Ligand binder design. Structure first.
Ligand code: B12
Ligand code: B12
Ligand code: B12
Lengths: 506, 507, 507, 173
């Protein structure tokens, strides 16, 4: 029948000829709400079962949601209307990151729940005003970084203090399951969600459409060969960057598997290679042509070099011009006196290895600086964030997914490309990789340490980096939780020492 | 992948979004001919398997062919071609009937064979000119009536006399399997085809894509009637200006849905059939009525009348109302060992009158000995539905081609039925008519109608005697050489008043 | 729910706890006819589907009907009555056989049609009085023998002469499909029914609950025998006082279990069949023997004897033992092109004696020319089993009605078989009998028995000649006008001594 | 055959018509102890595999054991018997809870082991008197509460002190 055909259109994700089939079904007799709560929602639930079992990939899930969203839009004039329940959903105060929260919005909305998306940087005052208006079954909160989890805790303390008892679904990149269980101390009705589909199951249980389930160690670092000399001291802008050159540094697996959710494992290497050629690569090729012509990636770089030294456990940063100490970084050391980042830096007043006294800034070197630290901030601007919010608003949920991940992995590619360029400048590119693939294995001299990662995890040191570099100069801002605004931006400390590779304190 | 999606589009019959998916597949690096002989033709072969097993119905088969035809049309500018084999396909000389032949054309063409459709009334001179040009694997010939099979025989005699040995696939309504086996005498390489899918399998075997299989005491005596009923007049008059809505109430919905459109009932419940009719069958019937009324592609006309008649032995005489002279005589066939004939429903010549029929029987006819009254009707729906159908088939709406054909055909039958009712009323024999429309199809009325060609009166050359009486031109109807009515959507009938008259078979 | 449980009770045939579940459903708010035309009739339709496919056997079909009949009996006080349509159902004039007719009654009644059962020996006068009263959708007629079909024909001639046009469903053992098609000459609206379920489908179509489907020598030349065997006496004597236990050892268990009771053997192993017999078939057979012995509802009688005979051409003469005069002559049919006849097993008149038969052949008969000896038997189980079965059918034990019928019938055949053995012994031709009971059914003995009506000797009016010889009254047996034996559970046979005599077909 | 039918009656749990099929199969030429250890025990073994995989639910497992228990009851007059091994099974001193212990008894008994169920509040003196009499392969002890586990420990200390080395299967909520 036509009932099975409307279910089919959701599961295959066929929008072309949908509005004909809806018009035929209603003039045949079926009511809009009847179709909504029946063949369509049966379709979207089957796609949820498939994704749950690992038989349907995430780009086709959002292709199903495009059909469901377009069906409900066509049947809204006929209806004069009350979902299965409501989630009030926000990203926390001092956070701008909105892909996870908006992914929840898409899955829940197209499974017949109501989602009141409150946007980004939303304080708890605003969230609870929405809870009073709508009277939802649950509150959702999205973060990115660990400082965004600390806000979520203060929000639960606020909510219990006011005397809200209703369930709080928390999710986020940095947020772990272990932490949300410790938060049940403060607010017992708090649940972690690993993905949007965990968020759907919680909302099923909390609206009574499911059975209660979820609801109840050293090596020594030696001296360096020499102190390499930077092209200059201080920090300069670079904007004239080719998108085609950066695209050669994209980590295609991190994009296809990690971001877009094209699964590789369980098939052959020729079966994966064929999928890339057919599905993954032509989308990557399309979004580059677009991003170049439409101008929705604006690559900028803020970069430079500084006279530094170790003073015990602190890495001092000297002024090239004055020689005075501008910042000190106390980096953490591994358990029982293992490795630290300060161990890659020459001590203050160290007798020079080579002829570094010829070129080190006079004032800095008299003040005791004996090594050189590189620094980079890259960014792709507010433009890709804007382009993505456009697609999500329009309802192209598939293209919303693709365009986001592209922008993100293109931003990482720029960090990688510019690292190469930071080596060349510095004169440490003798030992670089012959392929682009082997730069992801750290096939080069030194390494880049982004703040927040285990080696150097204090994100409040990004304010020390802004005091040195001046993030405004490429349109970048810090929020109160130390997030970079725009979201598509990443800082790194660029180390020359050849023995420097990545390590975990935890 | 997109290869499985192009196969899916054929089997489900989804044309909306096809030209996007074709354009995507070629730029992915797939050639036109790769698609034609590959993911698609696999789809059309699956649909053939499904229809063979009774898991897909015929309106969805032609919906699949619409997709395939539209795919090949989109890929034809890029290609510079070349099928699996060719059939030169024609309807025979003195025949106008083109639904069967065109159904073969659709199935074979969308299964990757080449069809050279030569149209209607095609002589063997023209057919063999085509065989020389194209050099096909087979020749096809479609008939309707039994006189069209006799042409097919003369054509095989012509083809052997010329020295063609090429396989001749024959099909037709009147053509039987038994007859084509007796024709192997004349032309050994002759094959019968019950449907288009039998025609596909033959073409598979003949082009080597298939394993050779196909290729190698009692009666009731009739009594006198109660009375001779009086007609509204004698002679024949026209009636146009008939409501299509009134005629649509006489449509035999099963004969249309099962018989013509191929919506299968059997193997499901009567609530399951009733639901199919509500969803699929009825709204198509409702659409084509609205269309045929507004767009004017059914033009119902009727030629009808009454005559003074008598039996003289085995011949039914027909007298002139004006002169009384004998115009026609019909020698009708009798059942084996002196059983029933149609002449047995007619009063003998000079028979002593049952009632006061001498008061009103035409003076001259009655003195000449006429003692009974025979009714006659020709109905027609015009050249217009034949035209409308050729339009759809040409543009490639094969589903709508099917629907619009069967509609026109069963609406033509409905008019014969409606007008029979009206022929009873006029005559004054509609006291005993059915309360339901459904029980008129069981002959729930007085007398019966005998169309020429059917077993009771099977000589189709008596339709020329009927045109001499009625004048078929007066509603735009003509006889061909094989005595077919042109246009094809027309049906003559002899209307008998005698209450004991029901249908019987001599064969 | 309880709706699905009332459907379940029909399909499984569970009477114990039914009246509780009906009382619960009425208080739950379900009207009588709601349940009747609802789940219950859905149950009886499922049982019809199962029996149609061979997944339910006939003893459980009648067990389902017991539940449905008992449901309707419980809901009749609440209701104030009017089925889907009516069949007036009768066995024809000169016929006493009522198992098939009553099987129709059970199936149609428990599928929501009304059955007006008029009994046995019903003339067409009586049948058409019922048609006037009730105004049914169809009239039904059951026969047994071929002379009962000839009455059905005269009844259709009567019905057309009166001017009935109503459908006549004919069924019967002797009645064939071929014959009912030839009867459409006389009465066009006549339908054959192979079983009761064919009768249900006809009644579905005729009441519009279905789509119209059903409704539209080079041989061995004669040999002389070894000798003329000598009978214990000449003439005919009675024998009563026969053990039912001895007769039960001659019952053809497959003919009873498969043939009569409808326990299917096909589709499963011989260990799977053997287990079914042990569980289902055998304990019912064991129960009905205990019953029939204690309750006395089988009354085995035998009328039997021997006669001086001769062949004179194509006639078998039968001489009086006392007078020697010819009493009867049997002209038996011969196979095509010379071929075999029964007269070929008999010595010619005045034939020179093989052995010393002139020592013992009746003086008068032998001088008159009799030279061979023919055996004759009538067996019977009385009016008693016919009465016992009508009791069960009336009380509504339809399963036990089936069982008790088939038992009586196959016990009657067993008596013919037992007594044949005994007729050989007497005659002195039981030297060559079978070691097993099973090999007596393949004619493992000297000579054979030919019952009148069977192909060899098919004229049933020769049973009057057999009564003139034997005197059927002497064991309470009567001939009707269609030459059926009354009571119905009785079988006459001609007992031939000649060793080469085995069964053959003239048709 | 009838061998496959007796296995079927265990796995489906069909009691009505079992005593007919047992009476028939001896005639087919198998002994009482024969059919027990053959199709029936595989049927039970199969039901164990099914419950292990989550394809049979626990009310049908105990319905299978009802069939096996009823089969052994019918075959006990013919036999003059001696299982695969013995468990002496008890609930500990100061405990009255007997559903788990009795569930062990049902599963083990209908899988052809002998179970000597000593009841509730059974001290170790009584349990070891039973071990002397029967000489089992193992001792079983059921508790409910955590104080019932502390008794089980004192019982193991008692058992080692006496010098029992026999396996002690402990279970409990
Ligand atoms: C992509 C990425 C980047 C991006 C980050 C910005 C972005 N995404 O636009 C880029 C390439 C720019 C980069 C840089 C940075 N990143 Co980064 N990055 C990631 C990475 C590789 C993957 C995360 C991802 O793709 N998320 C995509 C979205 C869809 O997933 P999500 O947000 O988790 O949402 C999912 C679920 O959690 C759930 N969900 C989320 N919220 C909610 C709410 C509710 C109610 C529900 C039901 C569900 C739900 O829904 C989603 C799935 O459906 C992770 C590694 C990881 N996660 O292991 C590190 C990670 C986030 N990076 C991290 C850090 C260090 C940084 C930087 C601070 C580096 C620096 N500058 O020094 C910057 C900061 C960027 C900024 N704008 O401030 C750390 C954070 C460490 C910490 N907090 O202390 C991580 C975890 C790396 C690590 N393994 O330690 N990185
Ligand atoms: C509906 C119908 C009509 C329609 C005709 C419209 C039409 N033809 O489509 C109407 C209602 C108008 C009507 C009228 C008449 N009818 Co009319 N009609 C029927 C009916 C019921 C069905 C025909 C049909 O359309 N079948 C569906 C089509 C698609 O089948 P088809 O044409 O045979 O083609 C199939 C196959 O044969 C095959 N095929 C055909 N050709 C070829 C060639 C090749 C190479 C291959 C591979 C396959 C192939 O392909 C098709 C299936 O895929 C038939 C009964 C029957 N056929 O058994 C009688 C029948 C054709 N009618 C008949 C007659 C008598 C008449 C009239 C003469 C009545 C009158 N005037 O007295 C007229 C004829 C029309 C005319 N113009 O002269 C007779 C012919 C008997 C005879 N010749 O002596 C028939 C057979 C009825 C009977 N049982 O006797 N009729
Ligand atoms: C067993 C049997 C007997 C029994 C009779 C018991 C009985 N009358 O039921 C015994 C052993 C006693 C016997 C005796 C004789 N038999 Co006898 N008998 C048979 C046998 C083997 C099977 C009968 C049976 O039980 N049928 C099952 C019943 C229930 O079927 P049914 O009545 O036809 O009903 C079914 C359908 O027809 C339908 N139906 C019937 N009526 C109607 C009506 C309507 C409206 C509808 C919708 C349906 C319907 O419904 C039923 C199924 O649901 C047949 C073989 C056969 N039938 O092909 C010979 C047969 C009937 N016997 C025959 C003969 C010769 C004899 C005797 C004359 C022997 C003799 N004395 O010479 C006698 C006749 C009986 C008598 N009383 O005079 C012949 C008839 C030959 C002929 N007419 O020329 C048959 C056909 C054997 C043969 N192969 O030639 N017989």
């Amino acid at each position: 029948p036509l009932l099975e055909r409307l279910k089919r259109r959701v599961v295959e994700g066929r929008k072309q000829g949908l509005e004909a089939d809806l018009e035929e079904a209603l003039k045949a007799g079926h009511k809009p709400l009847d179709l909504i709560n029946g063949p369509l929602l049966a379709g979207m639930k089957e796609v949820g079962d498939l994704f749950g079992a690992g038989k349907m990939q995430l780009p086709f899930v959002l292709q199903a949601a495009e059909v469901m969203k377009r069906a409900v839009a066509y049947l809204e004039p006929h209806m004069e209307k009350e979902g299965k329940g409501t989630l009030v959903l926000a990203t926390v105060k001092g956070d701008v990151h909105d892909i996870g929260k908006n992914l929840v919005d898409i899955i829940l909305s197209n499974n017949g729940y109501r989602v009141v998306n409150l946007g980004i940087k939303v304080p708890i005052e605003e969230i609870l005003k929405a809870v009073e208006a709508h009277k939802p079954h649950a509150v959702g909160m999205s973060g990115l970084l660990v400082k965004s989890t600390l806000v979520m805790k203060e929000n639960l303390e606020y909510m219990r203090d006011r005397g809200y008892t209703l369930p709080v679904i928390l999710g986020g990149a940095a947020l772990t399951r272990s932490y949300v269980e410790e938060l049940r101390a403060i607010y017992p009705n708090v649940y972690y969600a690993e993905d949007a589909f965990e968020g759907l199951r919680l909302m099923e249980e909390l609206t009574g459409h499911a059975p209660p389930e979820l609801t109840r160690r050293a090596r020594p670092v030696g001296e360096a060969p020499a102190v390499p000399r930077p092209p200059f001291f201080g920090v300069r802008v670079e904007e004239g960057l080719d998108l085609a050159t950066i695209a050669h540094y994209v980590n295609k697996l991190a994009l296809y598997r990690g971001q877009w959710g094209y699964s590789r494992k369980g098939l052959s290497r020729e079966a994966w290679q064929a999928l890339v050629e057919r599905e993954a690569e032509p989308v990557f090729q399309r979004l580059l042509k677009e991003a170049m012509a439409e101008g929705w990636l604006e690559p900028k770089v803020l970069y430079g070099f500084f006279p530094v030294a170790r003073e015990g456990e602190e890495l001092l940063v000297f002024s090239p011009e004055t020689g005075e100490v501008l910042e000190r970084f106390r980096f953490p050391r591994q358990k029982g006196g293992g490795l630290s980042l300060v161990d890659y830096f020459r001590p203050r007043f160290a007798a020079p290895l080579g002829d570094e006294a010829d070129w080190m800034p006079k004032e800095a070197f008299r003040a005791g600086a004996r090594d050189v630290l590189g620094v980079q901030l890259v960014t792709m601007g507010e433009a890709p964030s804007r382009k993505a919010q456009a697609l999500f608003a329009s309802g192209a949920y598939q293209d919303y997914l693709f365009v986001h991940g592209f922008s993100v992995e293109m931003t990482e590619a720029l960090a990688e490309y510019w690292h190469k360029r930071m080596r060349q400048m510095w004169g440490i590119a003798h030992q670089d990789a012959t392929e682009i693939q082997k730069l992801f294995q750290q096939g080069y001299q030194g390494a880049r340490y982004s703040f927040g990662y285990p080696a150097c995890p204090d994100l409040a040191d990004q304010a020390k980096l802004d005091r040195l570099m001046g993030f405004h100069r490429v349109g970048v801002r810090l929020t109160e939780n130390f997030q970079l605004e725009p979201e598509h931006a990443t800082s790194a400390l660029v180390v020359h020492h050849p023995e420097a590779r990545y390590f975990s304190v935890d």
